[PDB]
Amino acid sequence: KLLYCSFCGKSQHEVRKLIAGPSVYICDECVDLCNDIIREEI
Amino acid sequence: LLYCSFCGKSQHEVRKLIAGPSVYICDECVDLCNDIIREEI
Ligand SMILES: [Zn+2]
Ligand SMILES: [Zn+2]
């Protein structure tokens, strides 16, 4: 039942949303991080 | 080569590949994540 974000290791119970990939996951928190990285801004 | 773990595109076919412990996500998939999270197109 436990699913984990592949980037930070948090479970679905720890984040607001966990997005599925083939055999991976990424949570809303890491997405925020990806946006800063792509947009090169804080 | 390194590939986005979500769409499968290589590091040669995308603008940026972000790395995790042993996973990657490209700029294109991140855009899809923003749509998913913001529930908007
Ligand atoms: Zn995460
Ligand atoms: Zn991708």
UniProtKB/Swiss-Prot annotation, chain A:
Phenotype upon gene inactivation: Delayed and decreased induction of the extracytoplasmic-stress response.
Ranges of residues in domain ClpX-type ZB: 1-42
Record: residues binding Zn(2+): 5, 8, 27, 30
Superkingdom of source: Bacteria
Induction: By heat shock. Part of the clpP-clpX operon, clpX can be expressed individually from its own promoter.
Role: ATP-dependent specificity component of the Clp protease. Uses cycles of ATP binding and hydrolysis to unfold proteins and translocate them to the ClpP protease. It directs the protease to specific substrates both with and without the help of adapter proteins such as SspB. Participates in the final steps of RseA-sigma-E degradation, liberating sigma-E to induce the extracytoplasmic-stress response. It may bind to the lambda O substrate protein and present it to the ClpP protease in a form that can be recognized and readily hydrolyzed by ClpP.
Family: Belongs to the ClpX chaperone family.
Quaternary structure (record): Component of the ClpX-ClpP complex. Forms a hexameric ring that, in the presence of ATP, binds to fourteen ClpP subunits assembled into a disk-like structure with a central cavity, resembling the structure of eukaryotic proteasomes. Interacts with Mu phage DDE-recombinase A; this interaction remodels the viral transpososome for replication.
Name by which UniProt lists this protein: ATP-dependent Clp protease ATP-binding subunit ClpX
